[PDB]
Symmetry: C3
Subunit: 104 residues, 3 copies
């Protein structure tokens, strides 16, 4: 899913703003299993364009989405930023960037 | 999900028109678990507007929906009517009243 | 889902073009359970019209869909062709023939 350089960036990103815990490999495994449970191709996680397609497929479900769906969306937003080489310190900054790109 | 006065109303409502069996607390517990399973926020059951948003989210699936999906929709339609202080005797009257409001 | 005559045709249909493995009853059982998991009425597998409604419900998810979702769609496409008495040798021919029928509009 991620190259060696992308994995180094991934594991520096904090789960919550100002928190200590950071993303791990297991979050990518979890996201991949989650997409399977939602009948979405986990192979889309491998590219920026694939993550964009996943976010677009999930976005109409966000307003009413459970905590599980929101966490999945947030995780793939971070992955999109890592693929795009966008520097983000935490999950919220990636969501900010997703909103900014969509509005552009 | 329901206040004390609302729960008293809930348990007078008949599952079927003219039937003996009536709604119970377990139907609310079940509906909350069902929404989590469909990745919908169960906290939306707590308000009229939240129930309205659930019904709109589920409605495109009704035509081809399984028995489980239709029962879930019907239960939340009754819950919407209870939150709105709309007096209904049974599930069918709740569905009738919601369709007429939608036509307005 | 299928009559006895339909089951005989079903089990002659190849999963892949020119392949050896063929459709089995377990594919119908599996398709029926999959639909329940997707909150779709499995009784719709019993008729041509019901199968058309399922395919229409699933088709927008195909582009981003998992392997499981695509296999389910393809299985139901084959089942639609069997209900319609459309002769198919394999899954790919069933998808092709369904596409041609839609283009007649």
């Amino acid at each position: 899913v991620l190259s060696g350089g992308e994995l180094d960036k991934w594991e520096k990103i904090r789960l919550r703003p100002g928190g200590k815990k950071q993303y791990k490999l297991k979050h990518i495994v979890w996201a991949s299993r989650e997409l399977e449970r939602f009948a979405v191709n986990p192979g889309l996680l491998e590219t920026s364009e694939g993550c964009r397609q996943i976010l677009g497929r999930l976005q109409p479900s966000l307003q009413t989405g459970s905590e599980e769906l929101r966490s999945l969306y947030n995780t793939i937003a971070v992955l999109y930023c890592v693929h795009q080489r966008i520097d983000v310190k935490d999950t919220k900054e990636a969501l900010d960037k997703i909103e900014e790109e969509q509005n552009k």
